[PDB]
């Protein structure tokens, strides 16, 4: 499942290496198990060697180089519509008030 590896970490940006036949597209999301939390990276560039430059949608501390990262094959997607009215949401569309999950039908 996890198919790529971190090869650099410069502050907010992270470089990830993939097989050249599976390199993600230029706005896809990626996932990393940062310690115990789950960190989402958004890829900004395709460098040449199956490497990819991404921006971390979260705190970058604790990241080792060599961690496995998992290729979500779709961009960042957020809940939308009537379901999202009386509520506060994260940048990732996750609910940030202490209420339950959002009841959206569409993202």
């Amino acid at each position: 499942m996890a198919t790529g590896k971190i090869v650099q970490v410069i502050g907010a940006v992270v470089d990830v290496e993939f097989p050249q036949d599976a390199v993600p597209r230029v706005y896809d999301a990626l996932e990393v198990q940062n310690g115990n939390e789950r960190l989402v990276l958004e890829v900004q560039q395709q460098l040449g060697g199956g490497i990819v430059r991404t921006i971390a949608m979260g705190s970058s501390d604790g990241l080792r180089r060599g961690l496995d990262v998992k290729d979500l094959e779709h961009p960042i997607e957020v809940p939308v519509g009537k379901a999202t009215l009386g509520r506060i949401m994260n940048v990732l569309g996750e609910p940030v008030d202490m209420k339950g999950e959002i009841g959206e039908e569409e993202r």
Binding site: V26, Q44, Q45, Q46, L47, G48, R53
Partner: protein, 73 residues
């Protein structure tokens, strides 16, 4: 063994035996994509300002005819 002639024939034959293939002229491969600029490897007969055709019906303008790469927008 150590004769340079034998080595030069051995290397031409061994490289062919591996089945590497050079690029055709008038063709290349994208090797980098960022912020609207792409770097193309190969494409030796590109001309400065020439329209390059990408997958789809998109085009790019070859602006940098460097060595070892073409930079296009």
């Amino acid at each position: 063994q150590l004769n340079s002639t034998e080595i030069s024939e051995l290397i031409k034959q061994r490289i062919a035996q591996f089945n590497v293939v050079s690029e055709a002229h008038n063709e290349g491969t994208i090797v980098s994509v960022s912020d609207g600029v792409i770097r193309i490897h190969g494409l030796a007969d590109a001309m400065q300002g020439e329209m390059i055709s990408l997958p789809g019906n998109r085009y790019a303008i070859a602006l940098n005819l460097e060595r070892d790469s073409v930079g296009a927008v």
